[PDB]
Each structure stands twice: as C-alpha cells, then as structure tokens.
C-alpha cells in the first residue's frame, strides 16, 4: 500500500513488475499522455499502450487505467505493474 | 444617559422602534415593542448588505469620487418607514408610521385596554 515515486511517476514502491520492463512501460505511458490527453479520446491512448506492450514484451498484456477504480487479478510472476501519474492510476498485468 | 435616548426615540410621534448595528453586525440596543435580538439579528444582516452595497455602488457604479450616502429612507406599503443613519462605526434602523397608521395603533391599544377591563370585570363577577 506504500506508494513510491520513480522516474516522475507514482507507483507501488515494491514493484510487482520487473525493474527493466516497469521503467520502459512508465516511459511509454508518459510519452503517450504527452501526445494524447486522458480526458479527450482516452480510449485510444489505452489501446496504443496495449499494442506497444505486445511488440516489446510477452503477448496478451491486459491494460486498465481509470481516475477511480478497484480491481483484483491473477498475473504471471513479475508481470504486474501499478503506477499513478498526476490524478490517474494505470494498472497493467501480463497474462 | 444612554438609556434616555431609547426613551426619547419612543417619545417622538410616528416612531415604532429603533435598532443599532455595530461594524461587526451585533445589535447593540433594540426597542421592546419590536422583537429583541432575533429581529435585531435578522435586521442587522439585511441593513449591512444594503448599506455596504449602496456605499460601494455610489463610489464606483455612479463614477462619483468622494461621494458617501448619509441617510437611506425606504417607504413601503401601509405606514412602514425605515430611515437608516450611520454615526462613526454604528448604523441604526428606525421604524416610524404615518398619521393614519398611528391612529390605527392608538385604536388597537384602546381596544386592548377595553378587553383587559372586560376581563377584569369578568374576574370580579366570578369572585362574587
């Protein structure tokens, strides 16, 4: 439950996801937001992130990002990444 | 000394009650005929909003430099009159009535006195 800030993004201090992959995913999400805002056409940015994960990581990645939501899921070892950027929290688990 | 002014205000013909407001809005003294404190709390809030808005409006809305309202008099239906005068940091509201209104009030007072006399007579009869 102890949130930590890394590379300008707030995420769980103990990282469920791999340190290498988690940093890449956070950088990609920040770049995507810089281009497309969450508030307008928010569905498009989430879809782009999911396709990007398949290109550089194992396939069938699940990506869910919302301002307020609660979820519990089963994921592969070191395949779960949860982080908060500004007021938006992005959670992705690889299946 | 201060008490005498309230008695003097009542003495003036056509005067119903007097209410005094502090800069904060607390009512210093109010007339006994009119509701005390509950009416004063309700009257002080309305006059401050009106006096402050009018004072602010004259200086900016009318575009007149160094012009300040001295007395505001609101004439409504029946005999109601509500002259407002501000001295130092204290502003008060005075409620006075017209001649007809005063006559009506006197008649009402006379009727009340008559009713009281009738009640006394009834009590005497009961005692007898």
């Amino acid at each position: 439950q102890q949130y930590k800030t890394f590379m300008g993004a707030r995420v769980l201090w103990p990282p469920e996801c791999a340190d290498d992959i988690l940093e890449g995913a956070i950088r990609e999400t920040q770049d995507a937001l810089k281009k497309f805002e969450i508030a307008r056409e928010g569905q498009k940015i989430a879809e782009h992130l999911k396709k990007y994960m398949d290109d550089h990581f194992d396939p069938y990645w699940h990506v869910f990002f919302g301002k307020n939501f609660g979820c519990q899921a089963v994921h592969n070892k070191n395949r779960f990444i949860y982080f908060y950027i500004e007021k938006t929290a992005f959670l992705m688990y690889q299946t | 000394n201060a008490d005498d002014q309230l008695k003097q205000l009542s003495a003036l013909e056509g005067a119903n009650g007097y209410v005094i407001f502090n800069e904060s809005g607390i009512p210093l003294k109010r007339h006994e005929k009119s509701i005390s404190h509950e009416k004063a709390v309700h009257i002080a809030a309305l006059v401050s909003d009106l006096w402050n808005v009018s004072k602010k409006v004259i200086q900016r809305d009318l575009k007149t430099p160094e012009n300040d309202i001295e007395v505001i008099r609101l004439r409504t239906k029946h005999s109601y009159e509500y002259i407002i005068t501000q001295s130092g940091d204290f502003t008060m509201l005075a409620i006075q009535l017209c001649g007809k209104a005063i006559e009506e009030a006197k008649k009402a007072a006379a009727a009340a006195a008559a009713a009281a006399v009738v009640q006394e007579e009834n009590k005497e009869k009961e005692k007898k």
Partner: protein, 91 residues
Amino acid sequence: SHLDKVQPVIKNSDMSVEMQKEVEEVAKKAIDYCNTDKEIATFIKDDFRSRYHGTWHCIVGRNFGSFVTFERSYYIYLYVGQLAILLFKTG
C-alpha cells in the same frame, strides 16, 4: 479602512493555516467586488476552482443549516458580518 472593519472570523476551520490565511483575503476581496450575495458565491467557487482543481460547492446565507460530505482537510468555515463563506470539496 473597510478591510480592517470587516474583521472576518472563522468559527470552524479544517484546513492548513497558510491556506486558511489566503481564504480570508479572497473572502474580503469577494464581498467588496460582488454587488449581490449570489455573485459572491459564484466568485468564491471560481477562484478556488482555479487555485485548486476539484469540485467545490459554496453556499452563503444570513441563516442556514448545513450537513455535507467533503474531502478531509478541504472544508474551511468563516463568518463575516451576516454572510457565511463555506466551501467543501467533494470527490
């Protein structure tokens, strides 16, 4: 000298002291700027919304009773004259 005269007093405060001091200046500025009480409520909500992002509900009246569900430490209660400046941010 009118600003000295109003002497706004906060009966109940649930906010940081530095933030609370800023609210007093905005409250005094809003009353002189707004011709009517209805305008004062709109001005306070707009200034706070610009200063802090979120949903702000502000109600000011001579006599009223209020029970609200606001974010903790985002509710400041101050009374000036017969006007109550009450702002409570709800998520």
